[PDB]
Amino acid sequence: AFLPALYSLLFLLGLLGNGAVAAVLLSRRTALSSTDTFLLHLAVADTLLVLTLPLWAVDAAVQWVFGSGLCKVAGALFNINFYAGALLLACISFDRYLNIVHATQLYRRGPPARVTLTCLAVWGLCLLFALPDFIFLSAHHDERLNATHCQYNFPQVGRTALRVLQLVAGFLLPLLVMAYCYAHILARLKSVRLLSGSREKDRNLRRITRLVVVVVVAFALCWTPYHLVVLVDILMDLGALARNCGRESRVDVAKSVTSGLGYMHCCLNPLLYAFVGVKFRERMW
């Protein structure tokens, strides 16, 4: 009964952390910056995912006695978490790149509606990548396993296509945007006497960029291994490397551990935000 205890502990820790972050952020409403709104949406996604942990805690001891709509919602939330995180991080990185390099501000002089509608757009575009998860993921009942685990029903031919779509889009595209934007930020920031036209704004911009880059590094480090495992599964399905049972019993536990890391990131984010951002705790308590 180690897994239910661990799931409950993570549920409590993540709930407390993300609730505190969201409460302190919404306390000073109608005065947030673009990065503050993006981090608020990341916190919303993280708390929305960690809100499903007690269901898996119950499933770890007793079978999945929950129905099918709950299963669909849980799978959709798990996928939406790592879709929205990557896309919102790419948006914030592009904003930082523009501000550092071209000295142009989109979300500052423009209305807050400019960032509100891009947040709505990324939310909708993430829902429209998890619609296939809604179409599938019913609760089954297999032989030799007297349980109702959550699995997929659609044909194996479609599994490869969906996996390729998820991997390609939600890993390659944000990764390319990240690499380009951050390479240019580092090039234009390691050799400049004074960003903008003053010094206080220079150091403020440096601090904000440092916070953004540490958040991005944490997210990438937590979520990359799962995508590597999915890539390995995709290649072994096509025929590049063999489907030996000794190569399947290992990718199963690899998937389990990497999904656990993806779940732990949702509670790792707020304490990282508070420790590095000491000023955040100053305005919190």
Partner: nanobody, 101 residues
Framework: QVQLQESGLRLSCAAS????????MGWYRVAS???????KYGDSVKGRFTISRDNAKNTVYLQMSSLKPEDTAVYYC???????????????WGQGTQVTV
């Protein structure tokens, strides 16, 4: 922090410590050379002095010729530097030098 030690008729100012980059240098009592090599002087100086920079050793020099009694003063070296890539640009002064004729 970092230090800035001067010398004694040639003025050589050096910097040492944990510096990510040096940006500006000069002498005060009038002459300032940037990191790119551009040199600036006062509007009343018609090329009497000359300033050169050696970025490899992080040293700034000041060459003075045709000295006059009106130049007898105390001269301090100044430098701008950043201690890290994420840090703030800040400047430090030197102890100073005394010219006795």
């Amino acid at each position: 922090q970092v230090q800035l030690q001067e010398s004694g008729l040639r003025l050589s100012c050096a910097a040492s410590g944990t510096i990510f980059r040096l940006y500006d240098m000069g002498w005060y009592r009038v002459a300032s050379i940037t990191s790119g090599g551009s040199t600036k002087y006062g509007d009343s100086v018609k090329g009497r002095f000359t300033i050169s920079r050696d970025n490899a050793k992080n040293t700034v020099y000041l060459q003075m010729s045709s000295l006059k009694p009106e130049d007898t003063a105390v001269y301090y070296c100044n430098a701008e530097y950043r201690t890290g890539i994420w840090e703030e640009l800040l400047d430090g002064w030197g102890q100073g030098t005394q010219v006795t004729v």
